[PDB]
Structures are given as structure tokens and as C-alpha cells.
Amino acid sequence: EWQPAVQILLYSLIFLLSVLGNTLVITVLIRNKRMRTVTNIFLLSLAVSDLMLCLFCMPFNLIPNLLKDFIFGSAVCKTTTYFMGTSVSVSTFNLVAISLERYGAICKPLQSRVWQTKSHALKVIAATWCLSFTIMTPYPIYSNLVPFTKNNNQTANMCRFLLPNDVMQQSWHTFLLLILFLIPGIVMMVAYGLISLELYQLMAKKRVIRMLIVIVVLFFLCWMPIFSANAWRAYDTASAERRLSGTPISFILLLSYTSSCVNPIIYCFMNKRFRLGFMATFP
Amino acid sequence: SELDQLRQEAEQLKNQIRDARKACADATLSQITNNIDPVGRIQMRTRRTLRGHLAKIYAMHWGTDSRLLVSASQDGKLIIWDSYTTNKVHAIPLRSSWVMTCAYAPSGNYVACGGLDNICSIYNLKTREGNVRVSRELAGHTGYLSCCRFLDDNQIVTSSGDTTCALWDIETGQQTTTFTGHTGDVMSLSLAPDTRLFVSGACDASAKLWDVREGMCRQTFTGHESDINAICFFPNGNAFATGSDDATCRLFDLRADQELMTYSHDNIICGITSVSFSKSGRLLLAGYDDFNCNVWDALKADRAGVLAGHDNRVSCLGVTDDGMAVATGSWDSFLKIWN
Amino acid sequence: AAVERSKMIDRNLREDGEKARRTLRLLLLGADNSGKSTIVKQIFETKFQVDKVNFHMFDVGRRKWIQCFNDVTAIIFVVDSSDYNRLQEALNDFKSIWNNRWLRTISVILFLNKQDLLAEKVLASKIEDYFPEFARYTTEDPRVTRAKYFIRKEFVDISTASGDGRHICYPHFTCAVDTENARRIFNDCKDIILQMNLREYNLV
Amino acid sequence: TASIAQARKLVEQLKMEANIDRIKVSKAAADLMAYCEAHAKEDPLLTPVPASENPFR
Amino acid sequence: DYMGWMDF
Ligand SMILES: CC(C)CCC[C@@H](C)[C@H]1CC[C@H]2[C@@H]3CC=C4C[C@@H](OC(=O)CCC(=O)O)CC[C@]4(C)[C@H]3CC[C@]12C
Secondary structure (H helix, E strand, C coil), rough: HHHHHHHHHHHHHHHHHHHHHHHHHHHHHCCCCCCHHHHHHHHHHHHHHHHHHHHHHCCEEEEEECCCCCCHHHHHHHHHHHHHHHHHHHHHHHHHHHHHHHHHHHCCCHHHHHHCCCCCHHHHHHHHHHHHHCCCHHHHEEEEEEEEEEECCCCCEEEEEEECHHHHHHHHHHHHHHHHHHHHHHHHHHHHHHHHHHHHHHCHHHHHHHHHHHHHHHHHHHHHHHHHHHHHHCCHHHHHHHHHHHHHHHHHHHHHHCHHHHHHHHHHHCHHHHHHHHHHCCC | CCHHHHHHHHHHHHHHHHHHHHCCCCHHHHHCCCCCCCCCCCCCCCEECCCCCCCCCEEECCCCCEEEEEEECCCEEEEEEEEECCCEEEEEHHHHHCCEEEEEEECCCCCEEEEECCCCEEECHHHHHHCEEEEEEEEEEEEEEEEEEEEEEEEEEEEEEECCCCEEEEECEEEEEEEEECCCCCEEEEECCCCEEEEECCCCCCEEEEEECCCEEEEEECCCCCCCCEEECCCCEEEEECCCCCCCEEECCCCCCCEEEEECCCCEEEEEEEECCCCCCCEEEEEEEECCCEEECCCCCCEEEEECCCCCEEEEEEHHHHHHHHCEEECCCEEECCC | CCCCHHHHHHHHHHHHHHHHHEEEEEECCCCCCCCHHHHHCCEEEEEEEECCCCEEEEECCCCCCHHCCCCCEEEEEEEEEECCCCCHHHHHHHHHCCCCCCCCCCCCCEECHHHHHHHHHHCCCCCCHHHHHHCCCCCCCHHHHHHHHHHHHHHHHHHHHHHCCCCCCEECCCCHHHHHHHHHHHHHHHHHHHHHHHHHHHCC | CCCHHHHHHHHHHHHHHCCCCCCHHHHHHHHHHHHHHHHCCCCCCCCCCCCCCCCCC | CCCCCCCC
């Protein structure tokens, strides 16, 4: 009884904050043309992806979890499982894209000016969305309803992303772990480590350095439980579902959803520039 | 002795001119045309947006025909625009990137550029080669050229940073008349519709009325406190309005030999770059450094509109001869066509 | 062909704007016979290419024509360090070029050319006579290094108080036959673009 | 002698400015109002033209 | 029974 009460409270708290925190960024960045810059085009795409992540994950992964049945249809299960995957991909790739531009600006500034432009920024955003959509297209196809019968002889549904055989399933989750988690894991680490090394070699200097460390660590913290759980259930889903399924995996998936609620905080609301414009856009 | 006597005589003459101007005025423009029908809230909207330049646009000039205008930018490109269809007609490469002025000829055959190169390049638009080429490099000036106005296809008045203005026989390339009255860098120039007089504004906060044929400063109007960036003639030809960096715009009458009304606002602290007049002379439109063009009732001194469409400083504003369209150019590389 | 003309004009000027972005345009100030021509070892202009990074020089043979130069990469200020009478004039010129209403985002490279003439001026330089505040100042030859540090601080104390982190001065030193000006300009422009990018890409 | 020559030129220009014809500002204001009222029907800015007559949409 | 979870 205690556990569902602290589940709904935490889920709603991340929800209404993410919803409010992403619509404000989209409003300010679209309306204010002067504010728009190379990095703001990246932040705007990140805000849209986080808002897409919030709307198609949180209510669709909590109400079926509380009621223990998928109350929506099969077409809802397919359409939403595609937008969840796509939004995760765009969010993670925008963070890597911001880090690569940041590395170019600091380590090799003169060379960067020839290529790092606003037109170049739009091309990377266009490539990010078009590649994320293409790679997440197996999600609607392989996710369909699976029915079960309860103790009361009722009918119920489960929306599950299940491949035809476990030989493709283990290779899928291994592929997904590398490109989504592991490759940003060390690319963002080397990019923000060289920037931190070039700035360390006065109290504002040490400010920027430690915030780069918070970006990579909270990237790890948000995505490590769910990606490990996906790797766990790929090779043996009997031990993973016996321990984690139900209330623990709700908290695991919520910590994962928290990334789309802390990304506007650590990228926009901690900016001196963006807060001055946020007070100007709204009366 | 002699220089002190000439200074005292010049001070006495200027004091007599000031006393005559003070005794001549009894009312203002507002006290005469107060009880008339206003223009209302002019909902003048951005009809066209011209997005060609890649650098700061210093100056523009409207053609006699309503469609065509020419714009100068710091990238080294001079661009002629078709206002109605947002097309670009002519793109002119410039020998010197640093260009501070452009002009379109009343007949439409010629455009003139100038800048830090100290050379007024006349560009022939009507060429049998098939492209715009330099017609006459007017090199006599020893300073940056700030404003050039075409009297006709063989006479042009130019302003420059060498503190002088000159009338140039384009066929000979030599100054025919030189206007040596300004003690500071001349920044602006406006011709009269009859092409027999003109007014120029300079950095010494002085506007001077010069006769083209006579070659003398017939009248000097000293109503500004800052550098007069631009100047424009009222359509009748008997008054003109100026604009400076002291957040003020003043309308000066030729016949009354003085100013009529200040077109300034207490909400403005920035500087005016350009001023232009509507067809009937009842709207005065002034570009500003606050990024926003303010529209002013030219006969009632009421801020009837604000043209907010620019990211950076507005540098050049113009109203067509017909009066349909107002074009504003800015440091952000965009020209906006209004109404 | 009447609409395709405006498209083809826009594509031609787009390629011309890409080449002007590659170039790091620079401006020269300084009075007459201050060694401004001595700095170049290769409206007058000159071009020289270092390490696949272009630099463009500009000097004009003031508040109105300086408005064209508020989008340059840096302002190169050259001071004749050997003479002392126009040192105050150089200070006034640096004050005018730094505390400008349109130049609030441009760092100033500050070359101090012909330090050798100051070196034999010291070894032969009434620096206490020209400046009464030369006393209570504690910084090759120690007197040459002391005079160079005094000139350095006397020229950066105006820039430090103003600016407010948007742009700070970055001076150097140059002899008559010194050829390190290209490397000093390269390193200084590297730091200028670094300090601009840090703000641009919301890292600070 | 250049300063004396320029001062004499300034004296001559101000003496030419002294001999000029000045009308009252009321008559100039009435002429401005008359031109405004005469060309108000021809002005496209004070009174907005419809989109058929307006060449801008 | 309700055993399992959505991937994302
Ligand atoms: C509603 C759901 C289905 C998502 C819809 C997906 C796309 C239609 C959205 C998502 C991200 C949006 C993009 C995010 C950022 C930009 C940059 C932005 O361009 C500018 O900033 C203007 C150029 C300037 O800076 O002056 C507007 C278009 C674009 C591509 C947006 C276009 C529409 C996109 C691709």
C-alpha cells in the first residue's frame, strides 16, 4: 500500500516538471529570434525530444503498471513504443552533439570557425532526427499485445517488445547498449575531459569544470539501471523479472525518465544568458 | 587682430540671424494643426522582407519608380532590389568593402557608391556590356564619403569626411562646385524636388542649405546637438526634417529659415540613423538605434506606429515617391518593406 | 530567369561570405612613426598566411569611420616604446579605442615595437622625469625588464578596469628584427576565439 | 594667412545668409497642412488602401 | 501475471 503511494507521487512530480520545463524552453527559443545561436538550435531539439519523451513514456508506463493491465489498444501500444525509443535516441544524440561542438570550440577554435556555423547546426539536427527515426523503426513492428488470464478469469493485455528469437534479441540489446549508452559513455567523457583539462591548465574556471563532470555522471546514473536491466533480461529474463518487475522497475524507469527533466535544468536554467531572456519573453 | 575682427563679425552675423529667427516665430506647427483629423493607429505591417546581404547594411535609396531600391552593405556587395516581388536585380561587387553610402539616379540609369576608399564610384546600370561597371571614380575627395545624391545623370552632389561637399560633372570627373562650409565630417545629403537647392547635415550638428548654381550656403540650420546621420526633404520642397544621435528629430522650414517641431520621444535614448517623409507629408518615419522604426504623424507629432522587425540597429529608412511602401534596412542583414 | 536571377545572385554572394568568414580581419592603430610598418615582416592592407589561418591587416591613412570595424577579430595597437613625449598620446588613443560604444566586444592586441631603442636608451631614458608615479614599482637586463613591465602594466590597467570580461587586452613585445609577431598574433587570436566561443556555446 | 582667408570666407557666407526672405511660421504651417489635405487622397499610408489597390498582397 | 516492463 505504501509503495504505490510513493510511486504515483514521484511519477507525477517528474511528469508535471518535465512538461512545464520543456514547453517553456520551446516557447522562449522559437519566439526570440535574437536568442537563436549554434548551440540553441541543439537545445531546442533536445527540449522537443524531452517533451516527446515525457508525454509518451510516463502515463503509458504507470497507469498500465498500477492497474496491471494494458487498457489501451494494440495500435496505441505500437505507436507509443516507437515514440518512446525515438525520443530516447534523439535526447542522447543531442547531448553528444553538444559535447562535440563544445570540444571543437575549445581545443581547436580557429579551425572550428570554418565549419561550425548555424547552417551546420541545422544539418546536424536534421541528421540526428532522420537517423534516430530510422533506427527505432523495428519498435512498432515487434511490439504487439500479449494476453493473459488473471485469478478472476478476466482478460488483460501486455504490450511487450519481443523479437522472434532470443539470438536476435541478445544481439539487439547488445547493439543498443553500445550506441546509446557505452559510446556516449566514453565520447562525452573524452570530449568533456579534454575541455576540463584545457581549462584547468579563477573560481569560475572550477565552476565550468565540475558541471561537465555532473553532465557525464548524471548521464551514467540515469541510464545505467535500465540499460543493465535490458542486458540482464536479454540473456536471462527469469531472474530479472523475479527481482525487478513491478515496483522496483517503476523506480528504475523513473530515474531513466528523470534525464528528460534535468536536461533543461543543467543546460538552460543554469545559464545566465537564458534566464535574462526568459524574464523578457513573458510579461 | 584681423582674425579676431573676422571672428567677432561672424559671431555678430550669427547672433543677428538667431535674433531674426527668434523674432520671426510666433506659433508652432502643433498650435496650427492641432485640431485636425489624425491618421489613427496605422497598422503598417511587414509586407516584404529582403534577406540578401551577409553583413551590416549601411544605406539604401528608393527609386523614382516604386518597385526598385538599392542597398549597400559592408560585405562589399551593392544590391538592387525589386520591392514588390522581393527579387534582386543587380549585385555589384565593390573594390573597397567599406562602403558607407548608396544612391539611385532619378532616371534609373545610374547608382553611386562611396565609403572609406575616398572615391565616389558612379555605376552605370544601363550598359551595353551586359553588367554594371564603374562609370566615373570621383577621387577628388580626401576623406570617407558619407552621402551621395544624384541631381541628374551628369550632376551629382556628394558628402564626405573631408568636411566638404562637392558637385561633380560626371562627364569630366572634376568638381564643378565645392561646398566648403562645414567644420566637421559631412554625414548626410538631401536634394529638393526642383533640383535647384539641397541641404546637407554634418558632424558639427549643422544643416546647411546650398544653392547648386550659386554654390553658396544660402541658409544654415543649427537645430541639432549630435551628428546628423540623415536628412530628408518634405515633398513640397519648402521644408526638411533631420535626425541625429541625440534621440531627436527636427523639421526645418526653408522659408521660415528655422525649425518647426521636434519629433522626439522621452522613451528614446538611442540615436536616429535615417529619416524619410511620406507622399502627402503627414507621416514622418525615422529609423532608430533601439532596433525599432518609429512612425510619426509629420503634421501632428504623434507616434502613430512602431515598425518592430529588426534584430540589430536600423541604419537606412526610405519612403517611395508614390508613398505606398516604406523600406527599413538594418545592421542585421535584412531589409523590410512595410505597407 | 527573373526569379532564378535572384537565386543565382544569392548563391554567388553566399560563397563570397564563406571566404570572408575564413579570414580573421584585424585593424591597426597607432600614431605616425610608431613602427606600425615594422610589425609587418611580409586604407592600406597586407596579407600573410600562418598555419592554415588567414590574417588580414587594416590601417586608415574618428568615431564615424571606426563604426565599420566593430566586427573584426581583434584590434592591433602598436606603440613606439622608445619615445616618451607621445606616450600619453598613445594612452589617450588606447583609451579612445578601448572604451568605445561600438567596440565593446573586441580584444586588443598591443604590440610594443622597437624595444631595443628603449634598451640602449636605458643603458645610455628619463622615465622618472616623465612619470612621477614611477617610484614604488617592483617589476635579460633588470632595468630593461623593469621598464617593460612598467609599460605593460601602464597599458593594461586601463583595459582591466573596463571591458568586464567581454574582452581583455593581451600585449606582447617586439624588437626591430624580431619575427615572433606571427606566432604572437596566432596565439592571441586563438585565445580571443576561445574566450568568445566559451560564451557562444553556453559553457560559461 | 589660411585661417584669415577661411574666416573671411565664413564672414562672406554669413553675410549671404543675412540677406534672405523670411515668412511667418503660420503661413508655412498652413501650406504644409494644405499640401497634406490636398494629397491625403493620394497618400497610401495615412489611409490604408484595400488589397486590390495595394500592390503588397 | 504482470511480470515484465517496457524497454523505455
Ligand atoms: C510533433 C512531433 C511529431 C515532433 C515533430 C517533429 C519535427 C516536425 C520537429 C521536431 C524538432 C523540430 C525542429 C527543431 C529546430 C529547428 C530549428 C529552427 O530553425 C531556426 O531556428 C530558424 C533559423 C534561425 O536561427 O534564425 C526551426 C526548425 C527546426 C528544424 C524544427 C523544425 C520542426 C522539428 C524538426
